[PDB]
Amino acid sequence: SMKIINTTRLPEALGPYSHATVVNGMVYTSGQIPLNVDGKIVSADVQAQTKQVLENLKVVLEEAGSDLNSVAKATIFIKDMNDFQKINEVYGQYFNEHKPARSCVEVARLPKDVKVEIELVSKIK
Amino acid sequence: MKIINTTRLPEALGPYSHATVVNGMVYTSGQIPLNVDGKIVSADVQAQTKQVLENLKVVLEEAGSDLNSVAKATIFIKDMNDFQKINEVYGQYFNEHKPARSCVEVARLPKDVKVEIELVSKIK
Amino acid sequence: MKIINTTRLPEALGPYSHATVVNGMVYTSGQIPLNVDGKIVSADVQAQTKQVLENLKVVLEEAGSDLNSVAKATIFIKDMNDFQKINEVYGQYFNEHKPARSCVEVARLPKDVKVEIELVSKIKE
Numbered sequence: 001s002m003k004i005i006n007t008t009r010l011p012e013a014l015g016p017y018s019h020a021t022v023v024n025g026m027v028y029t030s031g032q033i034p035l036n037v038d039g040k041i042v043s044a045d046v047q048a049q050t051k052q053v054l055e056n057l058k059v060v061l062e063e064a065g066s067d068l069n070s071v072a073k074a075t076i077f078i079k080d081m082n083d084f085q086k087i088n089e090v091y092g093q094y095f096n097e098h099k100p101a102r103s104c105v106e107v108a109r110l111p112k113d114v115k116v117e118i119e120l121v122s123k124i125k
Numbered sequence: 126m127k128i129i130n131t132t133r134l135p136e137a138l139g140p141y142s143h144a145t146v147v148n149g150m151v152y153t154s155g156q157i158p159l160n161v162d163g164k165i166v167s168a169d170v171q172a173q174t175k176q177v178l179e180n181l182k183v184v185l186e187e188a189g190s191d192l193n194s195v196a197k198a199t200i201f202i203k204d205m206n207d208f209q210k211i212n213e214v215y216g217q218y219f220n221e222h223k224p225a226r227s228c229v230e231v232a233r234l235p236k237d238v239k240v241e242i243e244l245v246s247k248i249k
Numbered sequence: 250m251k252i253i254n255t256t257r258l259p260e261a262l263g264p265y266s267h268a269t270v271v272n273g274m275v276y277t278s279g280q281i282p283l284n285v286d287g288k289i290v291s292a293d294v295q296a297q298t299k300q301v302l303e304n305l306k307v308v309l310e311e312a313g314s315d316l317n318s319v320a321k322a323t324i325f326i327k328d329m330n331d332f333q334k335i336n337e338v339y340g341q342y343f344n345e346h347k348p349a350r351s352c353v354e355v356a357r358l359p360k361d362v363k364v365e366i367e368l369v370s371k372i373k374e
């Protein structure tokens with residue numbers, strides 16, 4: 001019915017949330033932020049941050065039995081709409097052949113003062 | 126498609142409903158900390174968070190779901206410095222069951238509240 | 250999974266599509282108030298809301314869905330002071346059918362538009 005996805009390959013979801021759920025053949029990821037497995041921000045650089053988020057999401061999807069080519073929808077929450085071209089360049093490297101639906105908005109603030117946070121909805125397989 | 130609107134909460138006034146149910150999935154509206162009179166309960170962020178989750182529990186129940194069936198939660202907040210206080214209350218509702226979550230600080234919330242939460246949940 | 254791109258609307262720039270359709274559901278990209286020339290139709294927030302909802306009406310049709318099939322709307326806005334005016338336009342599109350909704354004020358939207366709306370919808374019949 002429902003699967004709860006948590007991988008020690010990734011920085012822990014501390015406290016009351018998990019890396020992803022799988023319900024009715026759909027994966028719902030948590031928002032990923034640019035932490036490595038030690039739970040440290042990888043870089044001040046917004047392109048380095050976007051790559052770590054997308055590398056994190058590739059692992060979530062693998063563990064949930066999905067892949068990037070199965071993504072229906074991404075939401076990109078960012079700190080600075082002026083970084084959008086830089087973020088979009090890196091995103092386009094992960095979403096080349098497959099181009100899912102997307103929304104990108106500038107928020108006030110992200111966890112740990114990170115610059116980018118991305119959540120996915122993906123199909124199993 | 127089933128439209129959910131419970132009289133156990135203040136009416137969703139204007140062009141929305143408490144939730145919809147489609148293909149065995151409940152999509153809640155973003156709840157804000159209105160009491161049953163439709164007044165903001167308090168300026169206190171832990172009270173607001175509790176009011177929001179109490180409201181969402183009633184929505185899930187009237188939609189044929191429950192908090193243990195939640196897939197995904199999105200938490201929109203006014204102040205990321207309140208995150209630990211919000212998380213404490215949140216973990217009283219999602220204690221054994223820990224669904225997927227995103228939490229961002231927005232610029233401003235309806236009625237200048239400090240938290241709004243929406244859920245995606247499985248029908249039991 | 251089906252990819253939706255309509256020529257009726259300004260092209261998705263780079264690595265996204267107008268919508269995806271997967272397991273009987275349409276996920277739309279967030280629509281901003283661009284006309285078919287990809288220009289911001291107007292400074293007026295009610296004209297912008299109208300263009301957004303006209304753009305989403307066409308995505309839903311191309312996806313094989315409609316406004317009376319919508320499960321969930323997310324309304325991103327630049328100014329909570331505009332909420333009454335946006336809601337007035339939105340209620341014209343959602344009078345017979347009232348979906349679930351979330352509405353939040355973001356710091357900034359693409360091209361400094363005042364409103365952006367994404368939808369999750371059921372395939373029609």
Ligand SMILES: [O][Cl-]
Binds near residue numbers: 012013019032
């Ligand atoms: O939060 Cl991984």
Ligand code: NA
Binds near residue numbers: 031
């Ligand atoms: Na993360």
